[PDB]
């Protein structure tokens, strides 16, 4: 059914800012091929 | 940096605050539009020369610390 | 001139302890080799 | 370094990034930018119509020794 004939309507801005950022996120991860993940700082747990 | 930019000399102590060290400019900007609502102070324009600045933008903060790197 | 008599090596640790880093170093510059040129990745 | 000839050059250029937006949003500023926000209604702001700045220095509180 024709949407304009209906109350339904979303601001153009929303359909843009969301379409655009959805891409950058995607891209940024595409460029990824290796994730070096170094451990944090452990408790001293010193035997001495 | 702030000095050589806005052409305004630094003012130390209270007695001196003279009309000499005034930074001859035409407009100060404090905008908050565009995601995110967070704002940044923009200053233009100053008669002096030799200082240039650029504001980076990107989501996740990953793209900032990388567009900056790039 | 050179012949049979001479003359051993006093220690061999030198040799291998050199072939060591040559590797440990290589590996780094190896797994990083993917981010060179326009078709490199982060 | 233009009209100054070739030289070893250190960057006085300042690039500050706001986490909001996409790559393209970023732009050169014809002037200066500062990370610190205004005084906000602390307090009463930008931008004084025509402006005249001041690099005020030292304390500003009630005269204390
Ligand atoms: N048009 C091109 N086609 C293929 N490779 C290129 C091209 N332009 C530059 N490169 C390669 O990429 C460069 C090296 O970049 P480098 O600082 O080592 O890491 P990165 O590639 O991530 O910037 C070049 O010197 C070159 O070997």
UniProtKB/Swiss-Prot annotation, chain A:
Compartments reported by the entry: Cytoplasm
Subunit and partners: Heterooligomeric complex of about 850 to 900 kDa that forms two stacked rings, 12 to 16 nm in diameter.
Family of this protein: Belongs to the TCP-1 chaperonin family.
Physiological role: Molecular chaperone; assists the folding of proteins upon ATP hydrolysis. Known to play a role, in vitro, in the folding of actin and tubulin. In yeast may play a role in mitotic spindle formation.
Protein name, per record: T-complex protein 1 subunit alpha
Curated annotation (Swiss-Prot), chain B:
Subcellular location: Cytoplasm
S-S bridge residues: none
Assembly, per entry: Heterooligomeric complex of about 850 to 900 kDa that forms two stacked rings, 12 to 16 nm in diameter.
Family: Belongs to the TCP-1 chaperonin family.
Function of the molecule: Molecular chaperone; assists the folding of proteins upon ATP hydrolysis. Known to play a role, in vitro, in the folding of actin and tubulin. In yeast may play a role in mitotic spindle formation.
Protein name: T-complex protein 1 subunit epsilon
Species per Swiss-Prot/TrEMBL record: Saccharomyces cerevisiae (strain ATCC 204508 / S288c) (Baker's yeast)
Gene name of the encoded protein: CCT5
Full-protein interval shown: 353 to 422 of 562
């Amino acid at each position: 059914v024709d949407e304009i004939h209906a109350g339904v309507l979303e601001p153009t801005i929303s359909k843009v800012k969301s379409l655009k950022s959805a891409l950058e996120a995607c891209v940024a991860i595409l460029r990824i091929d290796t994730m070096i993940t170094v451990d944090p700082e452990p408790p001293k747990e010193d035997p001495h | 940096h702030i000095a050589i930019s806005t052409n305004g000399r630094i003012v130390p102590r209270f007695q001196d605050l003279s009309k000499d060290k005034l930074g001859t400019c035409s407009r100060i900007y404090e905008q908050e539009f565009g995601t995110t609502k967070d704002r940044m102070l923009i200053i233009e324009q100053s008669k002096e020369t030799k200082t240039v600045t650029c504001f980076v933008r990107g989501s996740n903060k990953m793209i900032v610390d990388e567009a900056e790197r790039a | 001139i050179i012949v049979k008599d001479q003359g051993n090596k006093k220690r061999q640790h030198g040799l291998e302890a050199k072939k060591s880093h040559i590797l440990a170093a290589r590996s780094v510059a190896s797994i990083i080799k993917t981010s060179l040129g326009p078709r490199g990745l982060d | 370094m233009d009209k100054d000839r070739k030289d070893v050059d250190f960057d006085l250029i300042k690039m500050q990034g706001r986490v909001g937006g996409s790559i393209s949003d970023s732009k050169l500023i014809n002037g200066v930018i500062l990370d610190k926000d205004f005084s906000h209604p602390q307090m009463p702001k930008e931008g004084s119509d025509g402006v005249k700045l001041a690099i005020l220095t030292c304390p500003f509180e009630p005269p204390k020794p």
